[model samples]
Target: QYVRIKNWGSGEILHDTLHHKATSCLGSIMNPKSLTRGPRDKPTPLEELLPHAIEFINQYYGSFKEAKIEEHLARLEAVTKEIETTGTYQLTLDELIFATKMAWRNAPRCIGRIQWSNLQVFDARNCSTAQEMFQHICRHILYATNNGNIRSAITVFPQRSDGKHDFRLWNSQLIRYAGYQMPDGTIRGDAATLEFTQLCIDLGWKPRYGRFDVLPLVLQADGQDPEVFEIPPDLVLEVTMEHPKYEWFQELGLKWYALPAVANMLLEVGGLEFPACPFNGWYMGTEIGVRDFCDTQRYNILEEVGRRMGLETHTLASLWKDRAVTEINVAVLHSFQKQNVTIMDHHTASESFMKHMQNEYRARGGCPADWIALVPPVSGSITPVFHQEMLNYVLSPFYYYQIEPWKTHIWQN
Candidate 1:
């Protein structure tokens, strides 16, 4: 018979099934540090990582109890003098290379890991500007959180305009569409983009794929509505020998890695059935439908039109359901939020729109994971109260990476 030790004072058996099992799985008998270091010897557990990270900041920067603004500034000056020389921002080539190597070697692997299970796809079909995309993305993130998921990462791809390499103008059109304000009055522009991107980072988003382009001719082209005009199919084949747009597209295609979020959406939700469209919002309203004969017939009309226009056509209407239509809206909203740096009341409304759509998805028996809840921070605040909790729920098995070096310099004019 096996014998176990008991607490002498309490005379109680002190075997913890969960802790013993966890420690045994970690093979900690060889080294006590193995248990302290956490799973895979990663140095921290998911629950403790954030607080320890905050503690690191406190230790490196000095506690809030003894913080001195002037002393901090003096230290900054001393460090700056040691690093800089001759009034030029310069580092030796070897030094630069060594710095890059160190960054990659020392940075936590979790920093590079993209969490896709917590991600949801949103299509900004009708969006014409970057601002619009920001608003749409933010709202969707907020709504997705409400449904008990934290949408931290998003992949935004333009619906190929005219099915060619001339994606510059199309991208510009997105920036323009994303910039437009909705009925509630939210301007989607640079400020919004920056804010939204920061929010995603704070909310545990890992950057994957983002592209911006400038097509000179497309920007200069004559049209009744420059924002909505589809690029001529013939123009797509024309090689602009000197145009930077061509080079950009080539480079992006060659270097861009496949994003799991996009792959999953295409595979699981039948997203591939819906060929990329120029305007996501318009596509949802006009092209995709659930019930009406007019709506149902429009799909066939679009296919015939695509065939005549030398575009690829596939029969997959069942994939493009009413729920899919709303998913696109949610996706667009989410993209906008991910890109922007700020959110306002109008942006909140945009999120509400996505939540409304999600409610519809739930009513139709969509999976529970598909219904997400998003709570926007109070207007103008830097962080939301429930931010950590939301992250913990959405990314159960993963952890957050801390911003290192303790101090960040803010320019004051």
Candidate 2:
């Protein structure tokens, strides 16, 4: 009974059952402080950064089973001087690699921690212009797509310097369909992207006005005005959804992008904050089946899918939504499998995550998790995580959600 948080709208409560014994809260006094946010308007002083940097250095050295105190002390002194002189410091390639993997392992909402160590980290910290940023993003998309066998990867761009020169990706993802609010009071494509699509149009991008038109990348380099770049069609791998047992499903003409690269997340390592690190893991089945296609705010195709399946969708007791979503999940899994795109079904993902959670508790003392987000959307009681109580807390070298750059941008007058 440590921290009991509630959702005000839903009247649902969650108990942080493991928070009292959480190692992060009760760690030794000598432990380095974990950072929650970086300065948005000023340079971080050496007084604040030195301790964080040293702690990260200690963690990196400690991770190696062999003792290397000499090397560790050398790095700590070097980073200290670098920060003192330049008001900021850079991470060695080895340190950056360790941080990214640890960050993935510490993510609270992700159910795919089993593959945290398998990521390919692309260091694009030297990227100086929007064009260079576009090229690196294209490379990330191509590499992660892997033709049909999607791979987990992240491309980290320049770190924040005085917050004024931070590099950022304005788009939420590397690939998403455009949405248009029709003059006839209808919507086209993904309704979730309506606001972003308008921004792209305002940036002088011509809309294709199609149900599945891929949106262009709006990139900001060095805190400058955003520039839009069209992603080459050849680089985007897509899977057309179809049910193995239902030939009519093919005629519905539904498809989704293979790569699920999140393009606008902030990556924090030690005392450094990277504003434009795009990362990706392969999608779980329900992400497309339930959230993307069936959500009322998105495509809203559930009723249509149910009617096609001969389910009584007009009545509440029929449980038509459940049956429809299950078949939709089946269609998504079958199509991805037939196309050879990497994807995991909900049941297998749940089992794998359960194993990872147990491994985390054995290696550490607790695993931070948001149980509501961890459970599968369709089958709540069927998964092992449904019965588990967990803690939720932030750890260093973590990825965090950032305010949309458009809303926070200081436009040059």
Candidate 3:
């Protein structure tokens, strides 16, 4: 190593050269933050997309056991015939031909509209022409099912101030009626008079009302006593406070339950007040609790005292469950069945699970029926842990299925 050869390139020079080469070689990879340059792959072909939808519907409707293709084709044919005969089909022959050429592009929309609209038309009252009937029935069913009531009228509005008319639907009776709000903001009128008025307007209905006679009753406008409502003498209302054991019996109380200070504190501290309280306000004596009390003490007048008066009357486990335990047990049994497992009595597993399901449903804006549907039936064969998981899966999705976008699509749209 007697002679040190002088290198022509400096270290910095060598490093810079390597870096520049690497940067160019890895241009896209190195600058992924840069905008993408190439065109994307074309979407799945229209033909393929149509098949996918048909397959999905067939699978979802439990029709996969048989060849649903033929049935679907038949439905298509029938719908086409109705459209042609009634002149109700919106698309022109040329448009349909174009869609056939580009089946994937149009198949989903066409099939979906036909299936849903045809079903509505088939169910409509006084359907004269298939096309008009389809539109009419679709509008009516859409309104009735979602609002829990039927429309009483229909109308049309011009698309533009001076343009040809466009069809619209309305509830005329709802439009004419006005809601009167009580001091506490409670609305006094039929449903047609309340929030549904806005809903009708949103649905493109013009509202109109006519005056009608009304009957008046003697009652206190704002009395806390259940008697103020003129609820029969046999009826009473009761409220309770949440306690570890007592919360389970809240439903057995006359009308409502007051949240325990501790429960409220826990909820507030956890930032989980959105659910409000499972038992916060009114309970009616003659409703669920009263029915239970009467059945429990049908044979013993001594035991029946104060049963209807919102007072606690003790009876056997039979009475307790009949009034309360049955609901809990049924809920537990359903969960076990849904999980394909068995729950041990000592676990009080069912009760725990039911409570969880109830709370979960409430958090997701579920109604009583929806909550009931979420619980699984108890079967004799499954394990508690598995059952719990199964219950969660079933109930969780059900909550989402009942709210917002899902509700609009599944129930209303």
Candidate 4:
């Protein structure tokens, strides 16, 4: 107001400046974006972050006093500001500890978050070279596999905030099978993995001409030269698949690795992105047998198995798909347990999830879950999750699918 008054007092054309100033004052009053203080229509980053941490700490640590909450929040806010200023920030031991647990807690897709706080967090966030990154990944495999008694774990690499993409993994996991395009346009292995498999092969990975081949790991640090790492055979606990009732099943040459480690997801927590964070749990049977093996887009082995099972495939009503799909699940379960690998059947997994939900319901006011995710891939309706009513919403500290490094680089160009 003083600036506008001074313009008017200085000259005659200053009348126009007052008019503009008066209009600008009305604009600022009406515009929400123009003001810093208001009834907020949307939550800012701090609003979204603070409560989630406070809620977990308040519940997970009942002894965490109110005074500490303010202190902890202040520390967290301080780290956030440092990240903004320096393009990097270091977390203290306690904060790193909570971030991993809370990342699992805020994962809405997983039915297994009841064990969220039990995660083993590995802070490899200071690794400087690509070689060091892969080494830690091997540790992730070894530590999580834990020689068959699989432990839920996450290995976090350096987060990127330098106006570029973060360090990223190219493999879907530390463990995954290769895919090859056959002579006649048929995919011989995991079709979803064909592009990655080709990249591995081009990078000089030799794969056996078999249906199941564990591909080497691919990783990148901040859009740099991608590197490959061969997982030591001894470190990977692979089960030689066989059937429960059929003797011929062993001849088909089918098997899968024990761990289903997810490598290509972004862990976004408290407005910080850990792009190369890989996490895993023991495989659920339906994930391997139903989708990976039976999806027509993938291995597409159901027809082969149907023929092997001597079922009539003349029509949909013949139930060969059902019989074959059901039997493949049986074989996977039988093979996994036969070798004493810690694997969960869908029925048992469902029961565990329901129990987890009930626990959450008692501990918190309500349990959050995704209905589509809670149900198994096969015989889904028979599972209790099919009948359950679920509320789904995004949560921070989540595992989310992001652009694969290759897709964003060579493929994009």
Candidate 5:
């Protein structure tokens, strides 16, 4: 059961048989898929769903060293009966909170899992309409944004039932700039969202056709046709980009949303799938400074920034990109700090993640991570995580990417 890991730069390798310790699974004697970790494309069969449900129950109770056996047994029996009769079961608020936190902690790609236990869980499972879902989501953004103080939070909508009545958020995130395809065949604004922005326009959303127009929420409730709702401008917290030293940086007229809430990822827990669990946390500066601003498929500002910096843009050997990117990152961090918005720099975030990894290893013998993603895009070897090796695996009560609701949706007549 040993997995081999290598550090490419250092030419060092190690065997990790102890990686299994990171998983919270009860190690069901039955087939592993019976545990049901990912999003289900269809309603889970009674035979499979029952075991997965019971396994989750066991994992939840097992968290408490002094768990009450009677209550545990009673809940288990009740969940089994509910599943047998109704084909699905509900989780208590306490259980739901625990499940959401566990999912965040179990996520391998997140660099800020150190704050997993501090998340605010909003239970919107009882919501049944698009309007109601919109209201709940607005509340979530308001609470999570917190006027740029930026508390981590997640809003869990109704669980998947019969695959037909599933609730989903059509947008990739709660707030993002709309990308418009211009008449001259060039993209304006965030090029990453061109398709989705067009979808928004197709659904009766009037496009302002600006560089940074905030996209609307496309909510799909109960497997119904998605309804578009504009996010109120007042509720949105934005940081206008400015450099502390480079006065010309602000002239570029750049700004970004303070909240980075991912709205479309599914939350899978206890055989129940939440097709729309919009979760948010404060941003890492590199996400905005490097990927969003510099990625060619995105804003594509790297070359422009170098040119603006009076660097030799045409000469790759001059290392103009290295110099320009550093200042761009500085400007992003400076702007967020000047506006009192919550953000962490790549260096500081990497250090914190290393401490978190240490805590996880001591607490559970191992910590799962995708080393490639964990390394900050800016300084690869400067960060501690870049030197460390880790094992990555899926665990129960985890968040899973789902097929875009628009792709597989059964249109209602």
Candidate 6:
């Protein structure tokens, strides 16, 4: 096989053959119905990229001997041929774990990758139905949250293959609040979720009116119709927000999930791809208090919270926005700690990330992190990540954004 491929001096013929077969085979894997969008770039050829992937695996886990390495190579080589013939490859247990952890480490935007080696990887590749995917997701939610001791874990469903994207979760996370657009052209909840929420209603989900209504899990797998299931309240750990001083904060009915589980990201390990990989980490307070709650596109609660703080919200000079953000963040930290939930404050998380940087630099000679993403949204300049230079690039096994589940539906028409 090596000699046959190597004999093609220009390598164009091999590249063309791989790209044509692999892409066309899984061309319609993304949803065709939903307007959710991802980068329009094509996936890399994994068979050709596995050598570097092996080296990358070794760079993180130094346990592989020459013979062990050869086994990986041989297995991947066999899968490469299989994929060439059948347009798919099956990852072994070791390979699955290796792919996930490396993908976590290679995630340039994540700050807590120092713990990448220990991520719990669940294999649910056999889930060919939406109901099965729903069950696995619920299991993942329960396991990863660990009753609020949030373990970084990921459950992967089937990959996109044969022009079909099976094992998809429509919710951005296993747990998220439903957004409802009221008749007055005002949004009652998270704007980010309004479109999805409407889609859910269109698909037969009955949403209750509330600020914190947990959206149901929508999964489309196999060739059947999409299915929706509500996440159990027990499996979802929510921190009822409270301020260290203000008595009115809890009355505001503010709360957030203990873990931030990001679904709809593609997990590319070696030459294989799993589009339905939902994973999470313990939240950094600002991710909830600042971005999710205060982002104009999200909850947009800054001014109301500011008015509650007895600040003059009408002017920019009062720093009402800034003050309100600080208070919200303060409440987030206090509430999470009081509930015994694992949440990191921005200052501490930044410091820990700096330590991760130094540790990573010593090991990898350089740490590739996205500066803008690595730094906190508020007070970024004061944080260490601001001063530190960063590099961002694509690497596999890695995670990437995929089109929204609805768009990939075969019944989009």
The predictions' CA RMSDs to the true structure, in order, are 23.6, 6.0, 23.5, 15.3, 4.8, 9.4
Q: Kindly report which residue pairs in candidate 6 clash with one another.
A: 30-408, 31-407, 31-408, 32-407, 32-408, 33-407, 34-406, 34-407, 46-271
Task: Give a tens-digit lDDT track for model 5, residues 28-114.
Answer: 232235323333456888887898899999988988989789899999999999998898999999999999999998887889999
Sort the candidates on TM-score, descending order: 5, 2, 6, 4, 3, 1
Question: In model 3, what is the error at residue 338, expressed in angstroms?
Answer: 33
Taking all chains together, each candidate's TM-score versus the true structure is 0.18, 0.91, 0.23, 0.80, 0.92, 0.83
lDDT of candidates 1 onward, in order:
0.25, 0.85, 0.25, 0.70, 0.87, 0.74
Checking candidate 2 for backbone clashes, the offending pairs are: none
Residue 326, candidate 5: Cα error in Å is 0.7
- Which residue runs does candidate 4 get wrong by more than 4 Å? 1-88, 184-186, 410-413
lDDT of 2: 0.85
**Minimal lDDT window, size 10, model 2:** 27-36
Top candidate (lDDT): 5
| lDDT of each residue in 122-175, candidate 4, tens digit only | 988778777888889888899888877889888888765542545778787788
Please, what's the RMSD in Å of model 5?
4.8
**Candidate 5 wrongly placed segments (more than 4 Å):** 1-42
Clashing pairs in 5: none
lDDT by residue for model 2 (153-200), tens: 999898998888989899889999999998899999999999999999
Between candidates 1 and 4, the one scoring higher on TM-score is: 4
Winner by TM-score between candidate 6 and candidate 5: 5
Model 1 stretches astray by more than 4 angstroms: 1-275, 280-344, 347-351, 354-358, 367-413
The superposed Cα distance between candidate 4 and the true structure at residue 306, in angstroms, equals 2.6
| C-alpha lDDT of candidate 5 relative to the true structure | 0.87
